[PDB]
Write a protein that binds this DNA or RNA. Structure first.
Ligand SMILES: [Mn+2]
Ligand SMILES: [Mn+2]
Ligand SMILES: [Mn+2]
Ligand SMILES: [Mn+2]
Ligand SMILES: [Mn+2]
Ligand SMILES: [Mn+2]
Ligand SMILES: [Mn+2]
Ligand SMILES: [Mn+2]
Ligand code: NA
Length: 326
DNA sequence: CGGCATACG
DNA sequence: CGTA
DNA sequence: GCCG
């Protein structure tokens, strides 16, 4: 049978039920915009179950027994199978509320609560926001200023160029420090909206103080448009032929003791990690985050040298990054 | 009924 | 709140 | 919305 947790099954990048999963993900996004985090999670889980199936769902009977499919998710699939369209999904898609909330929450620095307040105030367009600069945080100002570039897919060639400049700054800041590409690109995605790097040093503690030194060296090379510790959510000025474009880059430092946990958490997917943390606590009584895995009865942390160690300690079959696309 | 992942900036 |  |  299909396991109930997304961390118990492989989910490849390319799968066979895109139409159905995308419809469920619209409903999940809309639930989020209305502040229904539980409904969002159900619709996300149901969409993910379809991504893990080996073949297209052709008939409604093939949903029987699948986890996270109840009355509502099943009716969505039913109507898509019967008619090619789901009335509910189309009503959401076309709604002013959905389209504006999607527009605003895709801005760096804006989440659902901020977007909803702006919507209730009657704002509808990016220009509306630019017309009221006093109502913006510095983060939001940077997100709006660079919004067009930040909406342009990041390509592998960009990733490679960014990894070179980050490696150069890291090596200038601390000899022997390493840079690991994480996020969606480590899962095999060919494009993305941002690039994520995890930085460590093989000698425990040597990485203390590292991220401000890296940030100073990147800024002195003119590479930083926006910044500001362990996590830096940056916008880089990435050189292009005769020009440049803004790219979102996340830089994360971890001590080598935490590195496997940070690598696992920052590699994703987001649903995969939520499900893995839920599995850890609810099924094995252990507390997982990007720092470690804690046994609250013995009050001890599990020493891991690899991601494989973490899966093993949780009693899970190991899944490589390209099968974590839940 | 109530949980739903768990951190840092 | 925002970010991941 | 689904489920323990
Ligand atoms: Mn396949
Ligand atoms: Mn319903
Ligand atoms: Mn019908
Ligand atoms: Mn990413
Ligand atoms: Mn820390
Ligand atoms: Mn990122
Ligand atoms: Mn309830
Ligand atoms: Mn409910
Ligand atoms: Na946002």
């Amino acid at each position: 049978w299909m396991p109930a947790y997304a961390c118990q099954r492989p989910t490849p990048l390319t799968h066979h039920n895109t139409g159905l999963s995308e419809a469920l993900e619209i409903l999940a996004e809309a639930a989020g915009f209305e502040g229904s985090e539980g409904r969002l999670l159900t619709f996300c889980r149901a969409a993910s179950v379809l991504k893990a199936l080996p073949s297209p769902v052709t008939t409604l009977s093939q949903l029987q027994g699948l986890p996270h499919f109840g009355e509502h998710s099943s009716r969505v699939v039913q109507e898509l199978l019967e008619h090619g369209v789901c009335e509910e999904v189309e009503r959401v898609r076309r709604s002013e509320r959905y389209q504006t909330m999607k527009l605003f929450t895709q801005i760096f620095g804006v989440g659902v609560k901020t977007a909803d307040r702006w919507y209730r105030e009657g704002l509808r367009t990016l220009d509306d926001l630019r017309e009221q600069p006093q109502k913006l945080t510095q983060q939001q100002k940077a997100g709006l200023q660079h919004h067009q570039d930040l909406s342009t897919p990041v390509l592998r060639s960009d990733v490679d160029a960014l990894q070179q400049v980050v490696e150069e700054a890291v090596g200038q800041a601390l000899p022997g420090a390493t840079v690991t590409l994480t996020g969606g690109f480590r899962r095999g995605k060919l494009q993305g909206h941002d690039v994520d790097f995890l930085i460590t040093h093989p000698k425990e503690g040597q990485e203390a103080g590292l991220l401000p030194r890296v940030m100073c060296r990147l800024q002195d090379q003119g590479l930083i448009l926006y910044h500001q510790f362990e996590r830096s959510f940056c916008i880089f000025r990435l050189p292009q032929p005769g020009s440049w474009k803004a790219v979102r880059v996340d830089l994360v430092v971890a001590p080598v003791s935490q590195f496997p946990f940070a690598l696992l958490g920052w590699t994703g997917s987001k649903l995969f990690q939520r499900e893995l943390r839920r599995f850890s606590r609810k099924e094995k009584g252990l507390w997982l985050n990007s720092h470690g895995l804690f046994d609250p009865e013995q009050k001890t942390f599990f020493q891991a040298a690899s991601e494989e160690d973490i899966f093993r300690h949780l009693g899970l079959e190991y899944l490589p990054p390209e099968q974590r696309n839940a």
